[PDB]
Design an enzyme around this catalytic site. Structure first.
Site, short mmCIF file in Angstrom:
data_model
loop_
_atom_site.label_atom_id
_atom_site.label_comp_id
_atom_site.label_asym_id
_atom_site.label_seq_id
_atom_site.Cartn_x
_atom_site.Cartn_y
_atom_site.Cartn_z
N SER A 87 0.84 -1.22 0.00
CA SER A 87 0.00 0.00 0.00
C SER A 87 0.84 1.22 0.00
O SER A 87 1.78 1.31 0.76
CB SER A 87 -0.95 0.02 1.20
OG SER A 87 -1.49 1.32 1.36
N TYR B 64 -1.78 5.26 -4.43
CA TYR B 64 -2.81 6.34 -4.25
C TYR B 64 -2.13 7.58 -4.81
O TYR B 64 -1.08 7.99 -4.33
CB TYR B 64 -3.14 6.53 -2.80
CG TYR B 64 -4.09 5.49 -2.24
CD1 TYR B 64 -5.36 5.31 -2.83
CD2 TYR B 64 -3.78 4.70 -1.15
CE1 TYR B 64 -6.25 4.44 -2.36
CE2 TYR B 64 -4.72 3.83 -0.65
CZ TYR B 64 -5.94 3.69 -1.29
OH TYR B 64 -6.94 2.83 -0.79
N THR C 255 -5.42 2.08 -7.48
CA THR C 255 -6.68 2.00 -6.72
C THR C 255 -7.47 3.32 -6.96
O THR C 255 -7.05 4.43 -6.57
CB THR C 255 -6.44 1.84 -5.25
OG1 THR C 255 -5.73 0.58 -5.00
CG2 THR C 255 -7.78 1.76 -4.50
N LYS D 22 -7.89 -1.22 -9.89
CA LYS D 22 -8.50 -1.83 -8.73
C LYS D 22 -9.69 -1.00 -8.21
O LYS D 22 -9.58 0.25 -8.08
CB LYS D 22 -7.47 -1.93 -7.58
CG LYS D 22 -8.02 -2.48 -6.27
CD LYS D 22 -6.85 -2.93 -5.38
CE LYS D 22 -7.36 -3.43 -4.06
NZ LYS D 22 -7.80 -2.37 -3.11
N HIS E 98 -13.30 -2.78 -2.22
CA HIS E 98 -12.48 -2.23 -1.10
C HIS E 98 -12.94 -2.78 0.19
O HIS E 98 -12.99 -2.09 1.18
CB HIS E 98 -12.53 -0.70 -1.19
CG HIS E 98 -11.30 0.02 -0.73
ND1 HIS E 98 -10.60 0.88 -1.54
CD2 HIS E 98 -10.72 0.12 0.50
CE1 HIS E 98 -9.59 1.41 -0.86
NE2 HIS E 98 -9.65 0.98 0.38
C1 LIG Z 1 -7.77 -2.21 6.96
C2 LIG Z 1 -7.81 -2.15 5.48
C3 LIG Z 1 -6.98 -1.31 4.81
C4 LIG Z 1 -7.02 -1.23 3.42
N1 LIG Z 1 -6.23 -0.35 2.76
C5 LIG Z 1 -6.13 -0.37 1.45
C6 LIG Z 1 -5.15 0.44 0.75
O1 LIG Z 1 -4.32 1.07 1.41
N2 LIG Z 1 -5.10 0.42 -0.59
C7 LIG Z 1 -5.97 -0.37 -1.26
O2 LIG Z 1 -5.89 -0.38 -2.52
N3 LIG Z 1 -6.89 -1.13 -0.67
C8 LIG Z 1 -6.99 -1.21 0.64
N4 LIG Z 1 -7.90 -2.03 1.30
C9 LIG Z 1 -8.74 -2.91 0.53
C10 LIG Z 1 -8.06 -4.23 0.25
O3 LIG Z 1 -7.11 -4.08 -0.82
C11 LIG Z 1 -9.06 -5.26 -0.21
O4 LIG Z 1 -9.85 -4.79 -1.30
C12 LIG Z 1 -9.96 -5.79 0.90
O5 LIG Z 1 -9.20 -5.95 2.10
C13 LIG Z 1 -10.78 -7.04 0.42
O6 LIG Z 1 -11.79 -7.25 1.44
P1 LIG Z 1 -11.62 -8.36 2.64
O7 LIG Z 1 -10.39 -8.11 3.37
O8 LIG Z 1 -12.88 -8.13 3.41
O9 LIG Z 1 -11.80 -9.72 1.95
C14 LIG Z 1 -7.92 -2.08 2.68
C15 LIG Z 1 -8.73 -2.94 3.35
C16 LIG Z 1 -8.64 -3.03 4.74
C17 LIG Z 1 -9.60 -3.97 5.46
#
Ligand SMILES: Cc1cc2nc3c(=O)[nH]c(=O)nc-3n(C[C@H](O)[C@H](O)[C@H](O)COP(=O)(O)O)c2cc1C
Ligand SMILES: Cc1cc2nc3c(=O)[nH]c(=O)nc-3n(C[C@H](O)[C@H](O)[C@H](O)COP(=O)(O)O)c2cc1C
Ligand SMILES: Cc1cc2nc3c(=O)[nH]c(=O)nc-3n(C[C@H](O)[C@H](O)[C@H](O)COP(=O)(O)O)c2cc1C
Ligand SMILES: Cc1cc2nc3c(=O)[nH]c(=O)nc-3n(C[C@H](O)[C@H](O)[C@H](O)COP(=O)(O)O)c2cc1C
Lengths: 367, 367, 365, 367
Positions: free
Chosen positions: A115, A139, A165, A234, A258
């Protein structure tokens, strides 16, 4: 910020139980930043219940034995058809932060997505990766030179793909974080060049506000052209965005809501995948995420047109519970859980999963 | 009757929590007269759960920044695609009553709907509106002359549209108000002329009983002919009524089930909207109500054929919590809520909302 | 067994609330005999939830005022399009037994249905009815003489129709009654000739009654009695054909308040297919779950001519004798009157023509 | 291991109540081995709720009296259209173990299926059966000679059919057993040869793990040739497996999901039955199991293409509560429960059940 520090393997019976187990050792604000979702979390629940819409068939006398979970994506050989999703601020879950996760993903034998909102530097994460493959998730800054700088730094670190993303141009309505007045207890070194100071003490709301709102297809073209790496877009839930992204020069489509942290009152992510895959028409690989909890979910995604899935909250909760070894236990779990499913569905290898019949369940969750 | 009287802005995380909050400072009887609905409230629940039948897609690389919620209806420029619904007896919620609500609506920059069952006079509301646009909502007298007089005073006060609510010729079966033996603790100056006395001490059943039962399409033509103002017909859930109303001279359709406070074991209002919009075929504007609680709901209603929505219970709950400033906070919440939703759906302006693709969710609420 | 005995009017806000309230005045075994249903009562819940499958529209500017609920069926003029369903052993509800219900039904101005498994005599009931119309509902003896006698007694007492109940050749699997060892605490004058009921399970009572009912039985009852005959218990359209062909003058769509076959549809869901087959050849009575004016409306919009009311009236009787039961009828009439006004219906014929909104999401929406 | 030993009849009101009753007399690990299912048991619930998807009609004036439940299958005359399912280790439920179950089934008048994972020897079971008919269910050894011996031994005991159970090539994800660390407290004398040691102390995962993984249509061929007996292929949920099975020499199809103990997030067994029955097209008989708890269920299954059903959990719960008399009481309940259903649905005999119309319930469990 009192993040857990113990490193240990953990028994994973199922990943659902890991949420409540993690809640006892992670600080309240951070824990709920991790676990929560937009609104009353109906779309998080829909991500979970969507798996009951299409059910798997046991198949008999299929002449299968010792199924093989290995696959390949963009020339990476990986041990199972999943990778690590890009997740911000792993320090909320464990003192070893993204270096913990990275070691687990690397020793397991798959791909780390890093990330842009990491609390670890590239140097720290790289120590954990110890040579292992990484894809960098951007980002975007508003300033073009800063995007060139970030991408150059990512590529210099070893990234072999870039993940744009684009579903977070502004924050989701994350009620838990609002109610908790959640702010980051540490910095985000990769993006702080465009923040007003340090991420420490800022709300996610304002950090996304600093990133680029006015993303357009030209950004996909420009990131591809500048980096010379394959670009994933994404946060896709509508099939026309997969066609746009491809025509703008994307090398992969990453279906995701997300983790239901963004747009509220939207579909469970799984329910969107077939139409997306029909539009992609095999032009590029598909990564699917948002709600994967079981090997059966891995199988169902692939049968429905994904090439790989991405794992998120369960790995982070394993990280909370055991540092790199706890996160490893979760990856290991998923590998074994899939292997069972492969055997019982009549699947010898990963390509066989992509061809499975699914039973339509029109009754939904309560059956 | 000890109505709250504090005036202050309030934090709205979601509008749903405002109900329980308001319940702790509104007298039991009036509070339940506000929150309650017909029967066991299954149709009120239906109004809320309908929003899960059509789901929003997030959209990416849309080249959208700083979306604009401004719109226009019958020549009135308003700051967001919502207006205030006509609601009786605001003194039940707040000592400042309709004058409070008027100030919030006016300061925000939208249209106030004045209920014929107001506990405030025209000049007392006009005080709070301070020049702001107003639409008058008639509950008809049986006497023709009393109708002409009510329309004259409304128009004289500055109404620029008349709203005929025609779904209340008798009362709904409002179980809470029967059990509480609710009666109004003050009078209704505008309709007092046809009550046989004062509304103070009267049940709502008997107040509706005094208004006109035998409403016909001629009533619509008569109101349009006399007022010389555009007339909305309010209460519509069946498309044939839309055809009827336009043929009778209405200039707008107002789709509503009166907050589930009238006919019981009827559909959720949002589910009836596409059929009525298709029948209307853009011949006049459509206002939609009954269950709007989120910016997502505003977006979905517009995407489904509404031009604006009308807000009810949540603005009243805000009025109860902090007077005009409290109601203002609610309006501001909806505006910001919708701005988020626009950015994430790819909508730069309000017209773009009207063209959004919605995902059909045949599983409904439990998914 | 002590049934309540108090007589008084009641404030009916809805009929659902009357169940719990009655539970507090009727002894346990009997109350649960009234309230209970087969298996885990999934099909009784289906009867109730079926009403949300078809939703009413409010209609506007309909030029309607003071709707009229009155109607007629097989010559009998009634004040509303509902009648009292046949229910056994009313003394479980209230000391004044079937006479109390009789009087309520009679003063209100609709028709009473008499159960053969009644606890009162024809005579006890006729004093209650005070000159009011009645249909006799027969459970069949295995012996023809006894049927002739019952039928004559019933026409002698004044029966203007006969209701053949044919869905109870053996009992439903009623778990409440089995768990409670429920046995009738008194006798049924009208059928003891084929058994005393006092101390016997409903299983063994149905056991004595006729198991092998056939289309012949309907012809014969029509023939012997010379009165319009209803076949009661129908849920499949083919039985409506079978029935009319054997000389029935009416179809009574019902699943016996879900007290009979388990894991079957909610009753209202069966009604359209039956009405479509009947093709207005004979009148249709509908039952099994009516609780609201809205339900009366939907059943009529769906092909019924009237409905029959059961549980709520009997709960009303528990609570307040004749006067309680009367309050329930008066409730249903006023409740229906509201719905008529809001739906755009001036009269009962207008109800039979309403459009309904189809809700495919079901109860949780 | 403290198995109950009391022998008595029991008054069955419904089969569901037997589970909690049994839980109080059976040791914790064993009891949950018997009652539990894969994952969160969603598919065991689907097994049960599938019964509400097709609903029975009461039929009137059908000229029916004293329904006859008896039927015939592969030339066994049996008293009702149900047989006993092969279940491992009855000793977990009662000290009299498979010999007790056998006596009940033998005295009721139907067929006993013997599990290869029995805790009782052929001789012990034969004593309980006392000339009763028996089918033997094989879990295949990997070694060919050893399968020959197992089938020789079953045939010598009097087996008149073989049941190949092929849906357990590896274990289901049975969370209760994992969490209890369940191991078998006694031996399995029939399969000792290929565990090369006792089953005592072993997990089910390692027992299945010793049986054959790579079952192929040729195994079906080889079992039918070597044994000379009609072979059933058990565990079928997909119509293609039925084709495959008949083509490979099977004399019967057994539609089952192992009572949800195997593949998780699969359909409820009953929902799979019509498509399998349509494909079979009366070419061989069909046995259906996985969730039969009521007479209405036996009817529905026959009405859907089954010839007989197989009864599992409720019978073992009976065995726990009353040894052979309690199991017998369960069989007796089913037979009377069915009889009531025949009378009220207009079915004079078993063939009449197979012709019944069913009402389609698209609203599923919550209605
Ligand atoms: C705590 C947290 C932080 C996240 N931060 C980012 C991020 O920094 N960049 C990003 O592209 N997606 C981020 N996501 C989304 C994840 O890439 C991903 O789509 C998601 O965790 C999938 O859902 P799940 O964990 O419920 O299966 C984040 C998700 C969580 C739960
Ligand atoms: C407490 C209350 C009073 C109301 N009074 C009126 C009224 O006087 N005139 C009218 O046309 N509608 C009235 N309505 C209906 C509102 O116009 C509107 O249709 C309803 O509030 C929308 O439902 P929601 O507020 O639950 O979103 C009232 C609604 C409520 C809740
Ligand atoms: C306590 C009770 C006793 C009943 N007794 C009889 C009877 O003797 N004969 C008969 O035909 N139906 C009988 N019924 C069925 C009713 O005629 C009617 O079909 C049923 O009450 C409809 O269900 P509802 O009351 O839940 O609306 C009985 C119902 C109940 C609840
Ligand atoms: C405790 C238990 C053990 C079982 N053992 C076996 C077995 O050894 N071999 C086999 O083919 N099936 C076995 N099964 C599956 C049964 O043959 C049958 O498919 C199942 O019990 C049907 O589900 P129900 O009992 O929930 O109705 C077993 C089931 C249970 C509950």
């Amino acid at each position: 910020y009192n993040a857990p520090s113990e490193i240990k393997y953990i028994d994973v019976v199922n990943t659902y139980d890991l949420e409540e187990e993690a809640s006892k050792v992670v600080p309240h604000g951070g824990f709920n930043y991790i676990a929560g979702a937009s609104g009353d979390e109906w779309t998080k629940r829909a991500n979970d219940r969507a798996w009951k819409h299409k059910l798997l068939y046991p198949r008999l006398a299929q002449d299968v034995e010792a199924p093989d979970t290995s696959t390949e994506i963009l020339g990476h050989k990986i041990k199972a058809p999943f990778i690590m999703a890009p997740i911000a601020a792993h320090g909320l879950a464990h003192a070893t932060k993204e270096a913990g996760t990275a070691r687990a993903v690397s020793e397991f034998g798959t791909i780390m997505s890093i990330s842009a909102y990491s609390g670890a530097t590239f140097e720290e994460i790289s120590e954990g990766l110890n040579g292992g493959p990484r894809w960098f998730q951007i980002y975007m800054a508003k300033d073009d030179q800063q995007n060139r700088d970030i991408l150059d730094e990512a590529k210099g670190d070893g990234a072999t793909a870039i993940i744009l993303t684009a579903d977070s141009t502004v924050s989701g309505n994350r009620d838990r974080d609002v109610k908790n007045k959640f702010v980051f207890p540490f910095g985000m070194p990769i993006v702080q060049r465009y923040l007003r100071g340090t991420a420490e003490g800022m709300s996610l709301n304002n950090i996304y506000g600093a990133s680029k709102q006015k993303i357009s297809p030209r950004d996909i073209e420009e990131i591809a052209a500048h980096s010379g790496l394959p670009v994933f877009v994404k946060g896709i839930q509508h099939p026309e965005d997969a066609d746009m992204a491809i025509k703008a020069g994307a090398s992969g489509i990453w279906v995701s809501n997300h983790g239901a942290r963004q747009l509220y009152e939207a579909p469970g992510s799984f329910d969107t995948l077939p139409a997306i895959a029909e539009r992609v028409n095999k032009r590029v690989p598909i990564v699917f995420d948002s709600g994967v909890r079981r090997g059966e979910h891995v199988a169902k995604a692939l049968a429905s047109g994904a090439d790989v899935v991405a794992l998120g909250r369960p790995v982070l909760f394993g990280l909370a519970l055991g540092g790199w070894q706890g996160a490893y236990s979760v990856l290991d779990y998923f590998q074994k859980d899939l292997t069972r499913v492969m055997q019982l569905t009549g699947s010898q290898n990963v390509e066989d999963l992509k061809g499975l019949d699914l039973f339509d369940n029109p009754y939904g969750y309560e059956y």
